[PDB]
Amino acid sequence: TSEIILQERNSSLPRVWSKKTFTDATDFLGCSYAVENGTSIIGDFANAKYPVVNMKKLLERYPSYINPKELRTTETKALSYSDFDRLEKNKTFTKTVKSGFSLNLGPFKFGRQKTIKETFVHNTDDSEKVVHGELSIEVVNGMLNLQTAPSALRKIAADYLDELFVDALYNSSMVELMQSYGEFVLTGYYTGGRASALFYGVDTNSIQFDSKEKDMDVAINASYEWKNKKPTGNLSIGTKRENSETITNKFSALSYSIKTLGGAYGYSISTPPYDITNYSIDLTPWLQSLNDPKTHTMIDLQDGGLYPISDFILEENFKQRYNDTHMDFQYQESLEEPYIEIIKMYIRKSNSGEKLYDIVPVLNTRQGDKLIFSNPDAASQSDEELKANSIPATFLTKSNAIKDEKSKYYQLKIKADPNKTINPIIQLSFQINNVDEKGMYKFKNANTNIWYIYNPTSMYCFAYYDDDYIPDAYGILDWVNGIPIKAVTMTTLYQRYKIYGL
Ligand SMILES: [Cl-]
Numbered sequence: 201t202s203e204i205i206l207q208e209r210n211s212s213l214p215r216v217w218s219k220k221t222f223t224d225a226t227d228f229l230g231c232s233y234a235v236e237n238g239t240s241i242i243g244d245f246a247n248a249k250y251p252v253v254n255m256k257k258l259l260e261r262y263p264s265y266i267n268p269k270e271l272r273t274t275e276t277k278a279l280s281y282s283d284f285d286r287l288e289k290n291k292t293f294t295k296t297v298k299s300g301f302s303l304n305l306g307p308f309k310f311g312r313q314k315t316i317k318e319t320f321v322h323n324t325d326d327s328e329k330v331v332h333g334e335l336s337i338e339v340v341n342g343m344l345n346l347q348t349a350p351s352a353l354r355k356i357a358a359d360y361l362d363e364l365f366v367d368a369l370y371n372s373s374m375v376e377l378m379q380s381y382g383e384f385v386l387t388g389y390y391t392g393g394r395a396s397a398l399f400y401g402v403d404t405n406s407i408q409f410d411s412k413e414k415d416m417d418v419a420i421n422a423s424y425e426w427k428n429k430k431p432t433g434n435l436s437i438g439t440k441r442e443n444s445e446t447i448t449n450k451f452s453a454l455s456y457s458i459k460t461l462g463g464a465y466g467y468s469i470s471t472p473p474y475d476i477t478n479y480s481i482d483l484t485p486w487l488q489s490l491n492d493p494k495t496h497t498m499i500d501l502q503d504g505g506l507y508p509i510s511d512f513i514l515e516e517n518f519k520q521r522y523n524d525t526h527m528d529f530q531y532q533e534s535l536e537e538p539y540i541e542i543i544k545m546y547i548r549k550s551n552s553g554e555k556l557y558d559i560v561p562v563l564n565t566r567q568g569d570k571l572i573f574s575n576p577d578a579a580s581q582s583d584e585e586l587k588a589n590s591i592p593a594t595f596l597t598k599s600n601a602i603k604d605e606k607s608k609y610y611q612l613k614i615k616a617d618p619n620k621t622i623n624p625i626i627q628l629s630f631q632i633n634n635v636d637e638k639g640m641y642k643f644k645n646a647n648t649n650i651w652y653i654y655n656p657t658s659m660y661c662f663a664y665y666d667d668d669y670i671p672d673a674y675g676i677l678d679w680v681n682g683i684p685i686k687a688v689t690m691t692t693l694y695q696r697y698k699i700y701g702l
Contacts, residue, residue, distance in 0.1 A: 203617045206542070206603040210611035213675050217535040217566050219371045219667065221364075222248065225391040228498045229266065229346050230255045232365075233506055234382030235293075236307035239470075240315045241396050242293050243389060243500035245461060251362040252385045252512055253346070257647075258360040265347040265356075271390070272432040275338040275500075280416030282331050282409035284309040296501040297384065298348075301508050304527050307383070319457045320400045320473050331412035333399030333420045333456075337483075338499055339431060339490045342391040348507065357514045358690035359647045366648055369513065370665035370701065373534045373567060374521045378509075383526060385512055388505030389498050393462040393490040395483055397424070397437055400473070401454040415450040422446040423456070423476050435487040438480025447477055462497035464489040514694050515663060515701035517569040520628055530628060535566040538674050538702075539613040540606055542599045543620040547578055547586060556586040559598045561606055561614075562622060562629075565702055566673055572624055573635035592618065609637040611675025630700065634658040637679065641686035653683060654697055661697040674702060 222228065228245060230253030238247035258265055281287045287309055288294055297303050316332060361369075368377040399420060403412045422443045427434040437458055439447055447454050455473045458481065460466030466486035474481075489495055508526070510519040524530040541564060544557035558578040563571040578586070588594045599616035606614060624631045635658065642653040644666060654661035664670045671677040693699065 202619045203615055205613065205615050206600065207607055207611075207614040209537070209539070209613040210675050213611060214669070214672055215537070216669050217537060217673055218373075219669060221367045221371050222497075224494075225342065225496045225498060226266075226268065226344055227255075228386050228389060229253075229344050230258075231386050232381035232509070233384045233386050235384065236311050236382075237379070238311060238382065239459075240308070240311040241459070241461075242296060243498060243505075244396070245498035247382070248386060248498060249382050250364065250380070252365045252381065252509065253356055254360050254362045258356065265352065267345045267347070269343040269345075271340050271343050271392075273340045274426075274429045274431045275336070275340055276426070277336045278417065278420040279334045280331060280413040280420065281333075282412050283327075284313050286409060286413070287312055287332075295503045297506045298387075298504050298508065298511070302523065302527060306528065316398065316400065319398060319470060320455060325402055328407040329402045329404075329412075329452075331401050331403055331416045333397075333401065333416045335395075335397040335399070335420055335424065335437075336500070337395040337397075337424070337426065337435065338390070338392060339394075339487070340390050340392045340499070341432070341490075341493055341496055343502070344389055344391065345502070346387045348387050353507075353511050354514070354694055355691075357512050358694060359645070361512065361648060363648070366650070366665060369515075369518065370650075370670065371667075373532055374518060374525050375531055375533055378522075378525065381509070383509065384506040385509060386498075386501075386505065387507050388502030390500045390502065391496045392499045393460065393486070393496060394499040395435070395437070395458055395460050395466070395486070397456050397458040399423075399454060399456045399476070401451045403450060404452045405450075419447050419451065419454055419476070423454075433484075433487060435483040436480055437483065438474075439477050440480060444477040460486050461499050462490070463487070463495045464492075514699045516698055517565065517567065517571075517628075517630060517700050520630075521567055521569065524628055530568075532568045536568060537613065538566050539564050539615065540610060541620065542602050542614070542616040543622055544589065544618065545572060545574065545578075546621060546623040546625060550583045550587070554587065556583060557589050557621065558586065559589050559595060559602070560622070561602050563610075565700070566670075567701070569700070570622060570629040571700060572622060572629055572631050574624075574631045574633050576633040590618075606637070609676060609679040611678075612673075630698075632658070632660045632698065632700075635660065640683050641688075642680065642683045643685055643687040645690065651680075652688075652693055652699070653680065654688065654693065656688075659697050661693065661699045662702050663699050664702045670702060
């Protein structure tokens with residue numbers, strides 16, 4: 201509203217903010233994993249999407265980053281849940297994600313409900329009577345782990361990312377990247393075969409969450425048979441005769457659908473829904489197909505076997521955006537026009553209680569991050585100086601002076617606005633102190649084709665994949681071409697610099 205342009209985006213610059221560019225069980229490691237848009241079966245190989253880590257390249261240099269271990273066990277787990285928050289009553293999915301990460305369960309819960317609704321015939325059912333069930337039957341044969349020491353993860357980020365993942369990182373929005381890849385990277389899983397069954401019951405007489413869950417607990421447990429459960433037997437789902445009374449005594453209807461993971465002679469595609477007392481399926485051939493380990497696949501996740509994508513990238517702003525987007529704090533559908541806004545940054549309250557501000561250029565990136573170019577010596581200044589930034593006349597002079605300077609390096613829209621505040625001291629924005637376009641060097645990483653432009657006095661760095669369309673979006677191609685080439689090692693860069701992706 202009181203926004204005023206100080207420089208139109210140079211009109212000869214283009215307006216382009218983006219470009220739209222499993223043999224065996226061990227190949228899932230370092231791939232993205234889809235929660236929201238997957239099958240909702242935890243650890244299901246189908247939810248493995250695309251490679252994030254270039255594993256072949258990594259293992260060619262450091263073979264010890266991978267660590268397989270033979271297992272020979274069987275596992276059954278049953279879960280009953282009256283609603284989609286109760287889905288996580290045993291933290292089944294929660295504990296698969298890296299300990300300490302801020303996990304948003306919404307998408308997982310949404311995906312399960314979406315699947316339930318697609319798997320089971322459309323209903324008039326009174327949700328009060330509804331309870332859900334899940335069964336897992338697993339022949340476990342192996343275990344795969346990627347090294348996850350932070351220093352390992354940084355090395356991977358720097359040099360061992362899949363080039364199409366690097367593409368998505370710089371040529372689409374984080375939103376788009378998560379739609380295509382999913383939200384997590386596979387670091388720890390189990391291999392073998394698995395039968396997975398979902399149940400949908402209408403409890404005849406209980407509406408209490410716990411009572412219905414105990415009813416489902418009993419039903420699930422009366423509804424399958426594993427005789428002689430040897431690892432490394434007969435298996436069937438469905439009740440008959442005596443066991444059917446166990447079900448009908450508590451449920452007016454209980455239906456199920458199964459899906460087998462790996463093996464042969466099973467059910468690769470989720471089955472239509474069947475009444476538990478009417479239709480039984482013999483999985484015996486499928487179970488004994490699992491004696492051929494060639495038929496094995498990814499079947500479940502290790503605790504902490506899923507790492508956020510943010511652990512696999514160096515860029516501060518992408519890391520934060522991934523996190524914020526996952527948490528539903530931010531959502532930019534697609535990359536946009538960058539611009540510098542000269543606005544006010546909160547510093548402190550005067551001894552009269554008055555808010556005092558510095559005037560600051562803030563680069564808005566394609567991704568919509570705000571990179572505040574702060575003056576850390578602004579806090580030293582005396583109250584009356586800072587208060588003079590509230591005078592329209594000093595704002596004119598300073599804003600125009602900053603524009604005159606930054607204009608030498610950036611040909612994008614520069615605007616000023618005396619009524620816009622940005623507060624990084626109390627709060628997405630980032631602070632980069634002592635930004636100075638004159639003090640920079642650059643080098644290209646040969647493995648990844650990323651340019652890293654770094655200021656070795658102030659310890660900040662702007663990164664971008666090597667396609668001129670990007671510097672052109674910021675109208676900085678001239679400037680960057682003039683920047684002298686000076687290599688620094690990746691480890692020095694990420695250990696000693698803050699890196700921001702343009
Ligand atoms: Cl049926």
